[PDB]
Design a protein around this ligand. Structure first.
Ligand SMILES: *CC(=O)N1CCN(S(=O)(=O)c2ccc(OC)cc2)C(C(=O)NCc2ccc(OC)cc2)C1
Ligand SMILES: *CC(=O)N1CCN(S(=O)(=O)c2ccc(OC)cc2)[C@@H](C(=O)NCc2ccc(OC)cc2)C1
Lengths: 241, 242
């Protein structure tokens, strides 16, 4: 009910990062940076506010992500001078996936390693439901160039995180919104049928079945690819002794 | 000091007291009671289900809104109570599903009502990309494990069709993954130092690890040029059939 700013932070969490930046769209036309701060003025001070008055949307950075998530629920679809403000988390411009993490790698060892290409805001080695590592990681930098450095250096180079000499793999993080998704308000031939199970003997069944048989050979063939890739890697694992 | 003040503002339509506002609460003092647990989270409104494991030590508590359980998470995690230091996290989801091969013109509400034929859906979502286009994937979250197993089972046996186009959806079990909390330093023996005595660095060419790392690299090079043949080979058959 009543939050103490100046005491509202997850441990280690950094302030005014790209993760606590908001996209505020479907804006009124007379909107200014001054009025932007006014809407979010209860969430404490805000960092940068960039407002594309031509496109009718803008950005504002808050202190912590939870502050922004609070804001996002209090101000989404909020009516402002005729239009309904849409409020979402902004895309991360320097987010990176890391595969082939070793063990005894930790959120901190990652932030330490990747810090060599620029300022890291966050780095987390993703853990399964049993608390163990998956081999995947997240590394979010302060700005684009540090991620283009990290991306490029780790593709041409061989970046080893531990004594074990299998280098890590580094790809850009796909910026997908899996909270709001696609509502009906957005978006007739394709709807004129309901969700149903394709019934045997029908035309739609036969096509469904033609598709599922094509996924089969696609899986069978992929399976032979990652089968001998697996055992080649596996051979390699042996010779290290 | 400066503050924020809220009240009772939840979106309409959004379901409440789902698995997604359930907090795991660990490191409990052994004399913890339910009555005392609710008083603890009473800042954040009346709470739904409260569980306390038999040997005390940990429990769970449904809050109303995911965003409400966020606020309680950061204000109460690491909080001392009777000397112990509470670990607050979100509990896992026991009834979560990813769906692939979605047809176009599917929405959160359609997906939701589609999969209700198997049980109580609490959330559906059509994952979109950076330009707000559907991604072809989606999440379906049920309230109970039996519903999500039913939706799994009936969707590998049959061809579930969400629109008129006869391309059946693919329905897999949501891999439970923590990209929020990860594996901190404090949560990690002897091979530990075997492994951690080389700092992060690049392989220096002409070294017993550069030659090895190159091998690991050449296998990635193969793996990719081989999957492309398959991509090639399948995309040809895919078009034919269509
Ligand atoms: C996903 C996850 O973190 N799990 C799976 C089961 N639970 S839970 O926290 O998801 C959960 C279970 C029941 C419930 O309400 C009745 C709410 C939440 C987990 C957990 O915390 N248990 C610890 C555990 C048990 C067993 C194993 O391996 C055999 C590992 C961890 C963990
Ligand atoms: C990249 C970015 O800042 N966004 C966030 C706001 N929206 S979104 O609501 O579609 C969204 C997509 C992905 C996501 O990942 C976390 C979060 C939100 C975006 C958006 O609509 N950008 C404007 C735009 C400009 C041009 C075009 O051309 C098709 C489309 C959209 C993306």
């Amino acid at each position: 009910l009543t939050i103490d700013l100046k005491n509202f932070r997850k441990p280690g969490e950094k302030t005014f990062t790209q993760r606590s930046r908001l996209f505020v769209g479907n804006l009124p036309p007379d909107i200014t940076e001054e009025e932007m701060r006014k809407l979010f003025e209860k969430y404490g001070k805000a960092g940068e506010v960039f407002i594309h008055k031509d496109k009718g949307f803008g950005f504002i950075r808050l202190e912590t992500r939870t502050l922004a998530e609070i804001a996002k629920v209090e101000l989404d679809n909020m009516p402002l001078r005729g239009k309904q403000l849409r409020v979402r988390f902004a895309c991360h411009s320097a987010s990176l996936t890391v595969r082939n993490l070793p063990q005894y790698v930790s959120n901190e060892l990652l932030e330490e390693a990747f810090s060599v290409f620029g300022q890291v805001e966050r780095a987390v080695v993703i853990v399964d439901d049993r608390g163990r590592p998956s081999g995947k990681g997240i590394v979010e930098f302060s700005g684009k160039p540090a991620a283009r450095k990290a991306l490029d250096r780790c593709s041409e180079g061989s970046f080893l995180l531990t004594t074990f000499p299998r280098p890590v793999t580094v790809e850009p993080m796909d910026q997908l919104d899996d909270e709001e998704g696609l509502p009906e308000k957005l978006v007739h031939k394709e709807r004129e049928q309901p969700p149903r199970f394709a019934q045997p003997g029908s035309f739609e069944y036969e096509y469904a079945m033609r598709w599922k048989a094509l996924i089969e050979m696609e899986k069978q063939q992929q399976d032979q690819v990652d089968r001998n890739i697996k055992e080649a890697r596996e051979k390699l694992e042996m010779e290290m002794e």
